[PDB]
């Protein structure tokens, strides 16, 4: 009873792990964009759209995690 | 630590001719002598297809990467290699001439040239086998196909209708039992007739140039001819394919017994590539009759020119020319050759063991094991009518055999024993 | 001498000689001039001397 | 929503219904898209199978259909962030400090005017404490603008713009090109009028 | 003269019943494996396409899973009622053994479960 | 197939300095990205050297050459047969630099997209040459 | 830069070396100065259509560029 | 019993580890796509296609684990 | 009660994990901006803008966790 | 008894660790393929094949782990 | 009661994780700055400024963590 509830809240903390990797994966993504941009700035628009697009899919998993987080915490 | 020997020399103490079985012996001969000798190899083709899993390959149970292996892989790193065929052999001078012309000397010669395929025996055959749509199929894949071509897998599937022919060339040929896929096709083509995929007016007959399927094993040939009748298949002996017309799908056959040839419409044709004796082995006076090497049946040593040996398919041995049969011939040649370089006697005798699977169904097989005298072991023609036993043995050969030929060429895994 | 179009398409396949200091997109055009000017400069001298 | 303040007893009535409408019809957009694909709809999502077992693919195909909806439903967590951040600011502003010390001629004598009101905070109040209260105020509103302005775009740029870019396309092949050849013939009929420079 | 203005570049596909007939089903998909048996062959023979099969099995799964889950509710005790009676008494047998070997302070609380290995 | 220890060829459209030389031990130059060093067994590769310095070590002193030069721009190719060839527009020694004689009427430039890069290179050499003298 | 000068502008490598030396032509010895000289004539060839003299060699005269 | 139940819910939290690596693997893949795009923007199609195809396999493992999670949580 | 609070505050500590990864991703982001700037400094302002833009998406994850942290710490 | 059982289900959760690494390793491999494609796009089929091949070897370890999981879970 | 105080003082220790990541991120940033400087030393002042700027952002997380730390240690 009290033990399982303590584990449920504990797992809810684990969801903050992707939130960490998402930050690193984000900086890495824009780190490459600056290099890719300095390499060929004529095609900035294409790089830019693909840049933000990837970011969307990145935080998508992050949001997905929070779902599972509250699920086990309440289901 | 150890240094690679030189390939640009004038003579050696051991010389192998071949990479499929000639490379397995070298890699095994060195580990037996720890590299006290310098052995050279000279093969002809760069790629060695694994014909032992040819049928699992047609069922797409084995990827093209596990069915295609370069010849260099069979040979070890220390022993040099060169893709040049021997133009002639001089036993009296103990030397060998290559296609380029560089004379090379030797003290012990091992011949493993096997049976060289000759597509020119059948006019219009290679031209149709290469076509990605023509229903002419064969036993091996040409070298002009890439990884995206899978015509080999359509022989059984794309047989919607028409006259089918399974042609067997004149003995000696390669792929006696490891290429007979007329038992799996019958079962697959039995399902098509049940739901209408295969038209009811179709004809499949086995055109065998030879009088018998398995020459050196009567018990095996009796089971085949017995099972063909129970299934309902027709056979025509003494008839061999002669020509192939890719335009109108005409196949010219000829009955060698009567010399009467005929032309028959086909829509799905399969033929085991015919072999051809090489002249440089006859100019030296080594082959006997059919064109196989005249060597001993026990020690594999040549009758004359005791410093010359022979194994594999090119050897004239009253047994089935298989790969497992070669496994026991590798240990014998490296032994006798090891004793010849030391002047000792030949204590290694070959019993004639040959082991090849016979696929009796889509997912069932039975092993054809027999010694020199055609006598079979505990495995000879077991679980032949199918069952749970043959099913497991089939998966073990289809899903776990091609993964082993990488080790055989490397050296991590030796023969059965 | 082959033109620029044929030279660039043929030169972009260069793989044995690495070109990373200037990128291939630049080295292909620069080495084309060297290929053309060298022949032109050599011909003028031969003709002027003749 | 200002013009709807007298139309009912709830000022946010139309906004409370629209958020449900917005949710249901956005929830149906993926459903009708599968209905448009037909029975092959699973191939439009995941593509060709890998194993001969339909039961095995059945499990891989279910994940493909869930992900199809999670790409949508997961974007509603962005809306929660916009609301949570919007409430946090209304709480800080609604609870911001206001006293009689800021009033001109206050008559609220019972509201701490005639009492001893000391504190245990930093002195120089208008130089240290009160500016800090505005510093946090500037943070709450700048953080709110970034969240609502960024999450607002990410919502529609993903639920509609990207979602449809992945599962829909336009063909380049054409079935009829009779305009191209008529304009050429029609231009020869007007060759003389053009010669006059119209 | 509608065929005069018809563009043959639309022949890239052969669409019939919402399916392209120019699809290499022999090299890609569930139909590429040629080692399929009588049942798997007769299954594709009916539908001719993995897309229609997967689409139908999509709904058949919910039907079967909801059915077996019902049978496991109505029935099921025929094969698991023994494992529940065993765990029921076992959950009581081990509890009675704990009260025998466990440190209880002045209140009924096991405050020393790590006193020994047997207590843990 | 393969070539001897090495051979270097330094040529200029107006003069040939080394048709073929082996006594040299090492070569170093400055490319657009960074400085490189070409010596024996250097793999095959292409390089394009801007107007920077070129220093080459000699095991035995060669007459009329100092081993330290400033080129105006050239192409470099290292063939597969362990052979490198240096071809520059012009070559001279640092001792003949005659510094402080720059910007003597060619300062004017045209404000275009190409003139921007044109001046960019010209300025780079001025900054480079000043350091090359040191 | 030598790379972007050709990417964002149609400046050939030779023209780049010329513009590079343009600022130091006087610094280099007269030996190099006489070498850096381009003066010729180009005519569109009818009896007397056109006669163009190419002497600048640095601007869009001998090695045209997109930027100019 | 009650503890094994606590471990089950705990394992479900561990399933969020691929979610973290999947985010990083995404930013890394899109980071390379940017560079790979600047190096040769002519072949946007192939690069872009192979990108999402990789993203597919990446997230495939993600949802595979989620299934494994609920599986252990109820079996 | 306190025990459940003890694991709540324990989870609250986990929020410092993205705070850690966010620092590394930041260093990587500006690292690429520097090298990318050297190769093509003509577009400094462009790179600079995209640099700070990425650092914002980093804190987006960071603040998100802190929100999730304080929430579960009191809810 | 139940303690060992708790570790059994715990080890089962640990099998999701290669799943996370398999996801990251996938993006890295395809990220390189993207760059390798832009470099020399003439060998698409070759490079493309080697990519999927390597990936297949990854899932081999993945499935190996899962098999190992159920094995220790029931033996 | 006492147990909650224990997890609190422990979480306070967790703040040293960003302190560790911030160190590595600093080494990486200055690593690229050196290589970036050698590539184009003409803009040493620009790179140098942006370099320190990034580090300032690294310490932001540091201040965010230590701030959150003492708070959770007393709140
Ligand atoms: C609380 C519930 C919450 C859930 C809410 C979900 C609501 C969903 C609403 C969506 C709309 C649903 C309405 C469907 C309309 C269908 C209309 C129709 O019938 O048109 C046919 C139409 C197919 O036409 P087509 O694709 O355009 O073209 C067909 C080709 O031409 C064909 O080419 P072909 O001829 O080559 O193909 C061969 C054949 C191949 O077929 C096969 O595969 C064969 C299968 C095996 C058959 C058995 C063989 C037995 C063999 C026996 C052998 C005997 C041997 C005897 C021998 C004889 C011995 C003598 O294919 C077919 O003909 C069959 C295709 C049609 C199948 C239709 C299946 C519909 C099932 C729906 C069931 C439930 C309905 C409930 C409605 C309730 C309303 C109140 O069907 C569809 O398009 C299906 C699309 C439906 C997709 C909906 C997906 C929505 C999401 C659902 C799940 C979401 C889960 C996540 C929830 C998240 C919360 C929101
Ligand atoms: C031969 C020589 C003969 C002549 C010798 C003459 C020698 C004279 C000796 C004088 C002895 C001391 C005088 C004592 C009487 C003080 C009377 C008074 O009104 O003070 C009240 C004042 C407030 O305290 P309180 O009212 O009694 O309440 C008690 C508690 O404060 C209550 O606790 P709480 O927490 O509630 O209070 C909050 C706390 C809040 O916390 C604070 O204390 C705020 C301070 C934080 C900033 C600290 C950094 C300041 C440094 C900025 C400059 C740095 C430059 C270099 C930086 C390089 C970095 C590496 O305090 C405040 O609220 C402070 C607000 C008022 C100050 C802010 C406004 C300052 C105006 C600045 C304008 C400057 C323009 C130039 C004008 C200069 C002449 C007028 O007390 C003090 O601040 C004491 C001042 C002590 C001097 C500190 C040295 C400052 C150094 C300045 C560097 C630049 C000039 C260097 C010149 C070098 C010359 C060689
Ligand atoms: C127990 C609770 C029961 C509750 C019942 C509740 C009520 C149920 C009623 C409703 C039933 C559902 C309705 C199904 C029909 C719906 C339509 C449909 O879905 O399509 C059919 C659907 C088609 O299957 P498929 O996956 O699409 O086919 C795969 C390929 O396409 C097939 O490819 P293929 O055709 O080309 O060739 C297949 C095969 C080639 O197969 C053959 O060729 C054999 C053909 C033999 C035919 C026999 C003919 C017999 C003729 C009759 C006898 C002669 C007449 C004599 C008359 C005498 C009169 C007295 O080749 C293979 O090598 C297959 C791989 C090797 C086998 C792998 C098996 C993995 C099992 C792992 C567990 C191992 C357990 C061992 C220990 C068990 C000890 C208890 O059937 C199924 O899905 C079967 C169920 C699959 C569920 C698997 C999940 C459970 C895992 C196994 C259980 C593990 C144990 C768990 C607990 C253990 C506790 C001790
Ligand atoms: C400049 C950028 C940095 C940010 C700094 C800007 C803010 C600077 C603040 C300057 C304040 C100086 C004048 C303030 C004096 C009047 C208020 C005052 O005295 O404090 C009253 C009182 C404290 O009184 P006690 O704690 O009870 O002390 C009793 C002592 N016996 O505090 C207050 O009343 C709060 C001040 C009034 C808040 C008014 C809100 C204004 C709304 C601002 C929004 C602007 C929107 C722009 C559109
Ligand atoms: N079923 C088939 O069609 C088929 C075909 C070939 C091999 N095999 C299998 O391979 C097994 C062993 O093969 P093998 O060693 O007996 O022969 P082999 O078929 O492997 O060929 C012999 C090797 O020597 C080379 N060779 C042939 N003539 C040569 C010459 N004059 N000079 C230099 N090199 C020459 C060949 O290229 C090859 O590398 C056989 O037991 C058989 O089962 C089957």
Author numbering:
A (entry chain H4), H (entry chain Q4), I (entry chain I4), J (entry chain P4), K (entry chain J4): 1 to 75
B (entry chain E3): 27 to 443
C (entry chain g4): 201 to 250
D (entry chain A3): 249 to 446
E (entry chain K3): 1 to 120
F (entry chain d4): 24 to 157
G (entry chain e4): 2 to 69
Authors' text:
The type III ATP synthase was detected in ciliates where it induces tubulation of the cristae membranes. In this study, we present the cryo-EM structures of the type III ATP synthase dimer and tetramer with associated lipids from the model organism Tetrahymena thermophila in complex with the natural inhibitor IF1.
All protein densities could be explained by subunits of the dimer models, and no additional protein moieties appear to be needed to hold the tetramer together. In the tetramer, the ATP synthase dimers are spaced 140 Å center-to-center with an angle of ~11° between dimer axes bringing the Fo-subcomplexes together. In addition, along a perpendicular axis parallel to the membrane plane, the dimers are arranged with a ~3° angle. This angular arrangement induces curvature of the surrounding membrane in a right-handed helical shape, which is also evident from the detergent/membrane density surrounding the ATP synthase tetramer. The analysis of the interface forming the tetramer revealed that the specific N-terminal helical bundle of subunit-a functions as an adaptor for subunit-i/j and ATPTT6 that are positioned to engage in interactions associating two neighboring dimers in a tetramer. By extrapolation, the same interface is available for the addition of multiple dimer modules, all with an angular arrangement represented by the type III ATP synthase tetramer structure. This produces a right-handed helical row with 36 ATP synthase dimers per helical turn, which underpins the organization of the inner mitochondrial membrane into tubular cristae.
